[PDB]
Design an enzyme around this catalytic site. Structure first.
Site, PDB file in Angstrom:
ATOM      1  N   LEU A  21       0.827  -1.207   0.000  1.00 47.61           N
ATOM      2  CA  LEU A  21       0.000   0.000   0.000  1.00 47.61           C
ATOM      3  C   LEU A  21       0.857   1.251   0.000  1.00 47.61           C
ATOM      4  O   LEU A  21       0.437   2.312  -0.474  1.00 47.61           O
ATOM      5  CB  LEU A  21      -0.917   0.007   1.215  1.00 47.61           C
ATOM      6  CG  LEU A  21      -2.045  -1.001   1.109  1.00 47.61           C
ATOM      7  CD1 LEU A  21      -2.623  -1.308   2.475  1.00 47.61           C
ATOM      8  CD2 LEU A  21      -3.106  -0.421   0.178  1.00 47.61           C
ATOM      9  N   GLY A  22       2.062   1.105   0.536  1.00 48.97           N
ATOM     10  CA  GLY A  22       2.996   2.202   0.638  1.00 48.97           C
ATOM     11  C   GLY A  22       4.105   1.815   1.586  1.00 48.97           C
ATOM     12  O   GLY A  22       4.012   0.817   2.295  1.00 48.97           O
ATOM     13  N   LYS A  28       6.672  -0.576   6.584  1.00 48.50           N
ATOM     14  CA  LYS A  28       5.789  -0.893   5.469  1.00 48.50           C
ATOM     15  C   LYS A  28       4.336  -0.741   5.865  1.00 48.50           C
ATOM     16  O   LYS A  28       4.014  -0.727   7.050  1.00 48.50           O
ATOM     17  CB  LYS A  28       6.032  -2.326   4.981  1.00 48.50           C
ATOM     18  CG  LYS A  28       7.332  -2.949   5.469  1.00 48.50           C
ATOM     19  CD  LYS A  28       7.905  -3.924   4.456  1.00 48.50           C
ATOM     20  CE  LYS A  28       9.289  -4.368   4.881  1.00 48.50           C
ATOM     21  NZ  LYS A  28       9.677  -5.623   4.191  1.00 48.50           N
ATOM     22  N   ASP A 142       0.385  15.911  13.694  1.00 46.19           N
ATOM     23  CA  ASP A 142       0.847  15.696  12.333  1.00 46.19           C
ATOM     24  C   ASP A 142      -0.280  15.665  11.295  1.00 46.19           C
ATOM     25  O   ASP A 142      -0.321  14.820  10.406  1.00 46.19           O
ATOM     26  CB  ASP A 142       1.644  14.397  12.283  1.00 46.19           C
ATOM     27  CG  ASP A 142       2.450  14.260  11.010  1.00 46.19           C
ATOM     28  OD1 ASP A 142       2.876  15.312  10.447  1.00 46.19           O
ATOM     29  OD2 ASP A 142       2.626  13.094  10.563  1.00 46.19           O
TER      30      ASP A 142
HETATM   31  O1  3NG Z   1      -0.500   5.208  10.110  1.00 50.46           O
HETATM   32  C1  3NG Z   1      -1.710   4.848   9.999  1.00 50.46           C
HETATM   33  O2  3NG Z   1      -2.478   4.937  10.977  1.00 50.46           O
HETATM   34  C2  3NG Z   1      -2.295   4.366   8.686  1.00 50.46           C
HETATM   35  C3  3NG Z   1      -3.494   3.684   8.857  1.00 50.46           C
HETATM   36  C4  3NG Z   1      -4.160   3.202   7.736  1.00 50.46           C
HETATM   37  C5  3NG Z   1      -3.631   3.402   6.445  1.00 50.46           C
HETATM   38  C6  3NG Z   1      -2.452   4.086   6.275  1.00 50.46           C
HETATM   39  C7  3NG Z   1      -1.777   4.578   7.412  1.00 50.46           C
HETATM   40  N1  3NG Z   1      -1.932   4.292   4.994  1.00 50.46           N
HETATM   41  C8  3NG Z   1      -2.592   3.796   3.902  1.00 50.46           C
HETATM   42  N2  3NG Z   1      -1.754   4.238   2.849  1.00 50.46           N
HETATM   43  C9  3NG Z   1      -0.368   4.496   2.701  1.00 50.46           C
HETATM   44  C10 3NG Z   1      -0.070   5.223   1.564  1.00 50.46           C
HETATM   45  C11 3NG Z   1       1.226   5.567   1.248  1.00 50.46           C
HETATM   46  C12 3NG Z   1       2.240   5.174   2.086  1.00 50.46           C
HETATM   47  C13 3NG Z   1       1.960   4.440   3.226  1.00 50.46           C
HETATM   48 CL1  3NG Z   1       3.319   3.986   4.220  1.00 50.46          CL
HETATM   49  C14 3NG Z   1       0.652   4.083   3.548  1.00 50.46           C
HETATM   50  C15 3NG Z   1      -3.803   3.107   4.081  1.00 50.46           C
HETATM   51  C16 3NG Z   1      -4.457   2.633   2.952  1.00 50.46           C
HETATM   52  C17 3NG Z   1      -5.647   1.942   3.086  1.00 50.46           C
HETATM   53  N3  3NG Z   1      -6.166   1.733   4.331  1.00 50.46           N
HETATM   54  C18 3NG Z   1      -5.528   2.210   5.441  1.00 50.46           C
HETATM   55  C19 3NG Z   1      -4.310   2.904   5.309  1.00 50.46           C
END
Ligand code: 3NG
EC number: 2.7.12.1
Length: 327
Positions: A21-22, A28, A142
């Site tokens: 996802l990213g 990760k 943030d």
């Molecule tokens: O930190 C959280 O709480 C956090 C919690 C949920 C998500 C997230 C970050 N990042 C997503 N995306 C993402 C997109 C780009 C880079 C990264 Cl490392 C993550 C994501 C996608 C779909 N559902 C939940 C999440």
């Protein structure tokens, strides 16, 4: 380093990695499914195996745990933790899978704004979401469009329901407060000037964020503190005198005025691009001036004067909401 994982791989015999996802400076985030939630998709934050990021994630989990025991049934638009564990030094947290964040979608649309009703509903959620956070001795430190998730971003995005994510920086009222705390673009004057911060920090950011939604571009596109302050002055007005007498960082000032080379490349950049906040308005209708009146009160220099999210929710701008938007 990171973790030994490709697609299809299993974690703790509940999740199978179906894809990425990213990935970021912390580790990760991968897409998954569950044995026992039966077919269920989740984002799975996976913190690296280094001591400091681990102890940090733990604190984050504590936050998500607290969020998960006040938000009784979950009406407060915070990302929901569905599970956490210590998979061999790598802390892991299962979040419920969502769409794209308000910034990707803005990028994919070539940085052109959400219409006002779109903004207005997002603002409403944001205020409501963080007010809930603030009444529980917390500050998200943030906030930034990258950290606000659409539940689903089918495309104009069809549904403006949003979530707040990444509580990796959320700090409680007792906790030690770091001197510097936000993302440069969303950082308030009290932090730049190192005057201590608390919940109002969030409100400043939120103002910045709503600006970006309404215009498509970051409000303080900057990189240095001095420039950042100068931008603030040109857009919002002179920095309140007591805030200058009260600051340690006097290098930025002389005789109660900002020291600025107007002929520098950043000086010229500011003069060409930075304008009074009112003049960034698109239309002059009521629902537009209301929004900007909110923003200006959100961007009050003085954090003791800056409006609160509890007050922000009693604002005539939110009058323009659908009753299904209303909840
Ligand atoms: O930190 C959280 O709480 C956090 C919690 C949920 C998500 C997230 C970050 N990042 C997503 N995306 C993402 C997109 C780009 C880079 C990264 Cl490392 C993550 C994501 C996608 C779909 N559902 C939940 C999440």
């Amino acid at each position: 380093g990171h973790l030994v994982c490709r697609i299809g791989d299993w974690l703790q015999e509940d999740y199978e990695i179906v894809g990425n996802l990213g990935e970021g400076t912390f580790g990760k985030v991968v897409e998954c499914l569950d044995h026992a939630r039966g077919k269920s998709q989740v984002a799975l934050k996976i913190i690296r195996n280094v001591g400091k990021y681990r102890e940090a994630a733990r604190l984050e989990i504590n936050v998500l745990k607290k969020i998960k025991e006040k938000d009784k049934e979950n009406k407060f638009l915070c990302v929901l933790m569905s599970d956490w564990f210590n998979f061999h030094g790598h802390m892991c947290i299962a979040f419920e899978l969502l769409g794209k964040n308000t910034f990707e979608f803005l990028k994919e649309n070539n940085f052109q704004p959400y219409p006002l009703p779109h903004v207005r509903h997002m603002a409403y959620q944001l205020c409501h979401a963080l007010r809930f956070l603030h009444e529980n001795q917390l500050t998200h430190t943030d906030l930034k469009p990258e950290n606000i998730l659409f539940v689903n971003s089918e495309f104009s995005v069809k549904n403006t329901s949003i979530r707040v994510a990444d509580f990796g920086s959320a700090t409680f009222d007792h906790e030690h407060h770091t001197t510097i705390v936000a993302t440069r673009h969303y950082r308030p004057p009290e932090v730049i000037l190192e005057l201590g911060w608390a919940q109002p920090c969030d409100v400043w950011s939120i103002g910045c964020i709503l600006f970006e939604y309404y215009r498509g571009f970051t409000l303080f596109q900057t990189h240095e503190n001095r420039e950042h302050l100068v931008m603030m002055e040109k857009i919002l007005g002179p920095i309140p005198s007591h805030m200058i007498h009260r600051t340690r960082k006097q290098k930025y000032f002389y005789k109660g005025g900002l020291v600025w080379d107007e002929n520098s490349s950043d000086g010229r950049y500011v003069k060409e691009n930075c304008k009074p906040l009112k003049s960034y308005m698109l239309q002059d209708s009521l629902e537009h001036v209301q929004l900007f009146d909110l923003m200006r009160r959100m961007l009050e220099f003085d954090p003791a004067q800056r409006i609160t999210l509890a007050e922000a929710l009693l604002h005539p701008f939110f009058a323009g909401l659908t009753p299904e938007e209303r909840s």
